[PDB]
RNA sequence: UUACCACGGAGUGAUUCAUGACUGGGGUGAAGUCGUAACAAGGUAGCCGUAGGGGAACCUGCGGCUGGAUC
RNA sequence: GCGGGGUGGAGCAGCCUGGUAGCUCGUCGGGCUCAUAACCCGAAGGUCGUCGGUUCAAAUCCGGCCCCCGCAACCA
RNA sequence: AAAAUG
RNA sequence: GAAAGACCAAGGGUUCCUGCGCAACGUUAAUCGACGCAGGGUUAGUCGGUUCCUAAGGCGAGGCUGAAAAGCGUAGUCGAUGGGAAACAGGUUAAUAUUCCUGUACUUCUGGUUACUGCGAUGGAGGGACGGAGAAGGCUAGGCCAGCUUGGCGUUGGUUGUCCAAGUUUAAGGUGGUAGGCUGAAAUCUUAGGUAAAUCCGGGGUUUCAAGGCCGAGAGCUGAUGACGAGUCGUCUAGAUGACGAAGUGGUUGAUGCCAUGCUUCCAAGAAAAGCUUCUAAGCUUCAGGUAACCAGGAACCGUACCCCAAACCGACACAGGUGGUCGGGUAGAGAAUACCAAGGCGCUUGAGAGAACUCGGGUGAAGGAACUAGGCAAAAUGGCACCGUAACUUCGGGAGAAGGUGCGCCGGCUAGGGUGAAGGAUUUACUCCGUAAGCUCUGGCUGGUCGAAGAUACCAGGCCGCUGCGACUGUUUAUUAAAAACACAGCACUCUGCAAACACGAAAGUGGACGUAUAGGGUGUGACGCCUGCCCGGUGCCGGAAGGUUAAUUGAUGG
RNA sequence: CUUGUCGGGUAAGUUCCGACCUGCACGAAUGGCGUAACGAUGGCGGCGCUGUCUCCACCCGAGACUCAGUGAAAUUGAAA
RNA sequence: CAUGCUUGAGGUUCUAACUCUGGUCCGUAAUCCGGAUCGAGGACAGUGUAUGGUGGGCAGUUUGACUGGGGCGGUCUCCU
């Protein structure tokens, strides 16, 4: 049976990645938001 | 000249095909050709716009001349084509001075012919030249409603248009659909109509042949439920309980749509 | 022991008789019912082919004939 | 269970608003016709389904009864 | 203009 | 054994190898491990990326639009799943190899010297550059057989021989321009064209000739007196070491691989851009630049371990699930089905007994043969090739493999062919034409004999027929209780739309419709085909009309 | 109403096939009536075949049973 | 009754406002966008604001209680 995740990283990378994320300000507020909770990932 | 098929299987029982043995089976003309690409019905947005549209055939794109403005050079009509993305045919054209164009092919245009243009030209069929100078009375086809911009009406399979009256600087022409409509007598036409008139003698004989040529299956609202059509819902067969409309709710049997006001003092009688 | 071959079996068709619920017209019969289509110019001149309609004879359209009356 | 009706021989008005029963066909009698039909003229014909009640007066109001015609009789 | 039948 | 073998991509990240371990992990124990500790291991001008080019799409200087955030989009520049330079065989470690080593190649760049010279683009032309199906050929890998070399002479009848076993290998490149595919060629004069120019391309005229020009597998020759090769000899601790090292050839068969981005044919009419070739513009012009030969050097950076149809990836697991592409031998066989095997890999991480009921998966069954049941559910049965033969009905295609029936194993006798192919002949005297006995291979025919209970002998491999309802058919559908008569469909009709089209997404700019133009586009209903589709415009819709009656903001006469 | 009535098929047929017309409450593009070919479509009937059945019997593997090792689950106010 | 002064209503025409998803020139190497110039329409269209109509395309809600279960039926205040 097909599961729903099947891993790529390019789809990683353009989708969930540190420069999508800086693209809108929409993402922009979601770095500001871990960098305020204190994460150590803050990005995919 | 169209030929029946034999009824060997289930599809090819109702098969009418229509085949040309004078058109070019070679390769079309490259410098006048361009890619074009499909877009599924669906615009900048990504929404579909205009549904029921989507796959088909990779087409390209040729470089038809709807203007045909070198006027004086005379032509040689050099061969007859295909056009994937048109219902008449083309002509190849190859004018006094090389200068290869595509045109749209009139009715009987094979091999030879002029096909010269402008002010002083015969009244030969496939010369093009200004509404003005044309005699009254004379069949025309590709007439353009703006100097320069090229033409609009009468370009598909058959299509015709009649010059009917004349008078000041506008002449007066009933269109193909049973509408008089004035148009300026600065612009041009070709006279005579469109090639391929026994296009409407040709029958598809399978859902296939739809789907080969970019159309998607027709939903139709009553096999729907009410939250997606107004015709939809009931326990059977309904027969859409409330008048007949559109899936966004305009009615269909009968309303007027045309709402211009801008262009209505060029039409001088309705299609209706 | 092999070959020929009668009886008898198996499958599938053709043809011809008898019969069959129910149905289409036909013929004959009596003081039956509804009308009056034709025969006189039969009271809308009749017939022929064809198409549509109507309880029924029949009516109407298109073409044809005189085997139609009056002057 | 709810609703609407029962009036000459037949099919329909009159019941709203209590005091006057009408239309067509049919029947009878006389006409025109050689005779019947068609047509013309003149008449008869329903105390209003039954009982009971209010009222000075009931086809008409209010009840029961006998006859009919329509709907409804659902969820497990 | 109406004029069916025996 | 068309994988349960081998290899790429994604994904994983040390799981790879060695030494030392068994607490925990491993559905049992463990001396073992994809487990713990500690060391080691990934070598490139040619492989994959990066650098060069673009598709869908993304972003987008100015710009247009929008309360703000922001939306769209021009120039442009990112984006492979595509285009575009060049390497193969052998040896080697416990762990890497087209990378290291040996041997033989190929592509491209830089700096010089010589000799001759019009150089120059982002712009113009050519080229790159392409669909579905089908068919006839040519060839190659691979497979068999014969010969050859080396060894053997068989625990049990025979085996010194038309005996048994193994091996009989060798690439890239260079030379060659073949089977075959496409195309007329050269000279001279000229020009309403390719945004300017052009000697380049396109167009026009005249003269001459039947011969050039471009692609193109493959054979052969060479690479190669070399590598490899059963094995033998010497040395050492049963295994390591060094040297030597036989034969290494012909005939048939033959791909789904290459010629082939070819040829024929059909509509549904089948990517772009750069690299590449050539032409000139602005600029030099005796510097620069270009073209040839020789010499000397260079090719940076990143990934290379291991799993990869799975115990290492997606599923909470060492989970009967899922995961894209390549190779794919022998004997039967039409076959990549099926059966038994090769190369290679494995016996699936609890066992040992015993032989109760009952449950699961099967084998056989007396007489009967659907009597079972909601219902022939399940099971049983049929099943191949050749030949004979075959009904109603029909849209003339079909129904049809209708139905039903006969033969089939092995061993001999006689007999008809095809393909390949020495010697020969011919002139195109050489990668050539015709043709040949033996040999090898592939098709038949008529005629006996013979064994068994049974010869399509196992695996594999349609049950059929007669009335009816529905839907014309192929197809789609409720991922996870409904696959159907439901949806779609070709065909039909009504209706709107004259192009800045109707319509749809967007506070808007704009976009789709469509680089389309009434034989077109949207909406609606019906649903192949045949015969047809009757009456009603009172209700509610839509279309048309303008006379009269009413009727909003607005205006403000009059009166109080 | 209803298993309407008649005919066929079966020893026996609330289903099936052909008719009748009394259509509670068919009907002509929410199309009417037919139709060759097609269907993992609904109903009925035949031939063959059979453990479907009368009515089960024997046999072969995996559990169940015993021995050694590891070792759950739902549930549960307390239980003489 | 011509006149002179104004305004309401309509028709015809003109260009100069506005419009062009028409041509060619420039920015520029550019089917965007601006500017210039031709051509067409032209005080129309179109947008702002005020207003009548239409408007399940969309939205926020309502749709009573008693009742020998709920629904259907009946009842709901006053007098003997
Ligand atoms: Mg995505
Ligand atoms: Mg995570
Ligand atoms: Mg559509
Ligand atoms: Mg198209
Ligand atoms: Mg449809
Ligand atoms: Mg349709
Ligand atoms: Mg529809
Ligand atoms: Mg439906
Ligand atoms: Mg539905
Ligand atoms: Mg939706
Ligand atoms: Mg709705
Ligand atoms: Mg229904
Ligand atoms: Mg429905
Ligand atoms: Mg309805
Ligand atoms: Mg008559
Ligand atoms: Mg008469
Ligand atoms: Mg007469
Ligand atoms: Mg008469
Ligand atoms: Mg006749
Ligand atoms: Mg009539
Ligand atoms: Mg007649
Ligand atoms: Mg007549
Ligand atoms: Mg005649
Ligand atoms: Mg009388
Ligand atoms: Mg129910
Ligand atoms: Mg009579
Ligand atoms: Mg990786
Ligand atoms: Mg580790
Ligand atoms: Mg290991
Ligand atoms: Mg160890
Ligand atoms: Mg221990
Ligand atoms: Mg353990
Ligand atoms: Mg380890
Ligand atoms: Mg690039
Ligand atoms: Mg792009
Ligand atoms: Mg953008
Ligand atoms: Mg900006
Ligand atoms: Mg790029
Ligand atoms: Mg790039
Ligand atoms: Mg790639
Ligand atoms: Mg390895
Ligand atoms: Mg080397
Ligand atoms: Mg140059
Ligand atoms: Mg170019
Ligand atoms: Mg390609
Ligand atoms: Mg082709
Ligand atoms: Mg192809
Ligand atoms: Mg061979
Ligand atoms: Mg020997
Ligand atoms: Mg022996
Ligand atoms: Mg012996
Ligand atoms: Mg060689
Ligand atoms: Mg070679
Ligand atoms: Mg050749
Ligand atoms: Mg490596
Ligand atoms: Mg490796
Ligand atoms: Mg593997
Ligand atoms: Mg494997
Ligand atoms: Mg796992
Ligand atoms: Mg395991
Ligand atoms: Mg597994
Ligand atoms: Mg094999
Ligand atoms: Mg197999
Ligand atoms: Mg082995
Ligand atoms: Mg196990
Ligand atoms: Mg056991
Ligand atoms: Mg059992
Ligand atoms: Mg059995
Ligand atoms: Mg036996
Ligand atoms: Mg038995
Ligand atoms: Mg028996
Ligand atoms: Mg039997
Ligand atoms: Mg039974
Ligand atoms: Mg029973
Ligand atoms: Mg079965
Ligand atoms: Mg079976
Ligand atoms: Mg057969
Ligand atoms: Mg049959
Ligand atoms: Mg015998
Ligand atoms: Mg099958
Ligand atoms: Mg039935
Ligand atoms: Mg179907
Ligand atoms: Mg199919
Ligand atoms: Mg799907
Ligand atoms: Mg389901
Ligand atoms: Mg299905
Ligand atoms: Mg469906
Ligand atoms: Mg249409
Ligand atoms: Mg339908
Ligand atoms: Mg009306
Ligand atoms: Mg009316
Ligand atoms: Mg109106
Ligand atoms: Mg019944
Ligand atoms: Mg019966
Ligand atoms: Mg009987
Ligand atoms: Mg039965
Ligand atoms: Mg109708
Ligand atoms: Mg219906
Ligand atoms: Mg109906
Ligand atoms: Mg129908
Ligand atoms: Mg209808
Ligand atoms: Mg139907
Ligand atoms: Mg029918
Ligand atoms: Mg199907
Ligand atoms: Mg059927
Ligand atoms: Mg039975
Ligand atoms: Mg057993
Ligand atoms: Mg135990
Ligand atoms: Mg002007
Ligand atoms: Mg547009
Ligand atoms: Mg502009
Ligand atoms: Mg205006
Ligand atoms: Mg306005
Ligand atoms: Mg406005
Ligand atoms: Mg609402
Ligand atoms: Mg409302
Ligand atoms: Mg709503
Ligand atoms: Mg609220
Ligand atoms: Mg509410
Ligand atoms: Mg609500
Ligand atoms: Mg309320
Ligand atoms: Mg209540
Ligand atoms: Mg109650
Ligand atoms: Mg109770
Ligand atoms: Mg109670
Ligand atoms: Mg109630």
Known sequence: ?44 | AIVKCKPTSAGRRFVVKVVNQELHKGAPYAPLLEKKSKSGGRNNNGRITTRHIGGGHKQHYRLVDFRRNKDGIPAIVERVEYDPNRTAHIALLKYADGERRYIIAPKGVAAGDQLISGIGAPIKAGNSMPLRNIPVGSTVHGIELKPGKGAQIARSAGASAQLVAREGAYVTLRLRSGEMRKVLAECRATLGEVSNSEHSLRSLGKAGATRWRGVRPTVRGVAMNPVDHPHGGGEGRTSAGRHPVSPWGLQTKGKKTRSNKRTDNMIVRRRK
């Open chain 1, 1 to 44: 049976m097909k599961r729903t995740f099947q891993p790529s990283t390019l789809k990683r990378a353009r989708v969930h990645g540190f420069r999508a994320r800086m693209a809108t300000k929409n993402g922009r507020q979601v770095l500001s938001r871990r960098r305020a909770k204190g994460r150590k990932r803050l990005t995919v």
